[PDB]
């Protein structure tokens, strides 16, 4: 499958069947980025209007949860590939770290818990954290700043 994020929607295509299989309706006007949960049935999306949307792909096409933990446009959302963590990064110079448990088999929806607000990046010309990425194994997050730095966040 290929996930395609426009400013307003996320469309999921099956490259084998060559057809659209799902259209997500995040309810934002200015989506900025998506990431896909490593077990493949959930998605997060950032928006310039300060929101992060969690979509449970099988549950409904509208957001399962709307996260409002930023004072400014959110530029990146990123899942850890192995640990039950994800992050959002915004123009307020802040990164927010979350826990998420997903229940693959049983009739329970995801458990999302905010964990930590990471501060340190300097806001430059209304820009803050421009990108972020998790370490593939460790609970370590790397961030890219408008302040000319990249940074490593650790336990």
């Amino acid at each position: 499958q290929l996930f395609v994020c426009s400013q307003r929607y996320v469309r999921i295509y099956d490259l084998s069947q060559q057809i659209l299989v799902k259209k997500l309706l995040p309810g934002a006007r200015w989506l900025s980025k998506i990431d896909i949960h490593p077990r493949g049935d959930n998605l997060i999306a950032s928006s310039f209007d300060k929101r992060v949307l969690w979509h449970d792909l099988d549950l409904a096409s509208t957001p399962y949860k709307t996260l409002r933990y930023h004072e400014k446009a959110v530029r990146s959302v990123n899942f850890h590939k192995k640990l039950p963590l994800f992050s959002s990064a915004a123009d307020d110079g802040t990164i927010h770290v979350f826990h998420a448990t997903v229940y693959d088999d049983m009739m329970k929806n995801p458990m999302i818990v905010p964990l930590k607000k990471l501060t340190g990046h300097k806001v430059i010309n209304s820009l803050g954290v421009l990108d972020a990425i998790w370490h593939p194994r460790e609970a370590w997050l790397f961030s890219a700043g408008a302040d000319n730095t990249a940074r490593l966040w650790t336990t």
Partner: protein, 77 residues
């Protein structure tokens, strides 16, 4: 009638609590033109419309039959 692709969306309709009855259906078809395979079709009677879900793989089909609620009526072929 209304097809659904997504698996999460089907489990919401079973818990919607207008749906009195469902029905399962099994069809023999041939993939590409190489060999036969055993398709399934999980249909569910909504009040307005008939929602349905086409699963091609036989392994995923058998777990889906268990994943239905017991309180819902289910009807084979």
């Amino acid at each position: 009638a209304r097809e659904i692709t997504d698996i999460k969306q089907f489990l919401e309709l079973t818990r919607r609590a207008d749906v009195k009855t469902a029905t399962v259906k099994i069809n023999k078809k041939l993939n590409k033109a190489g060999k036969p395979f055993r398709q399934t079709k999980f249909k569910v009677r909504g009040s307005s419309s008939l929602y349905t879900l086409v699963i091609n793989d036989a392994g995923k089909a058998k777990k889906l039959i268990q994943s239905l609620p017991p309180t819902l009526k289910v009807n084979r072929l």
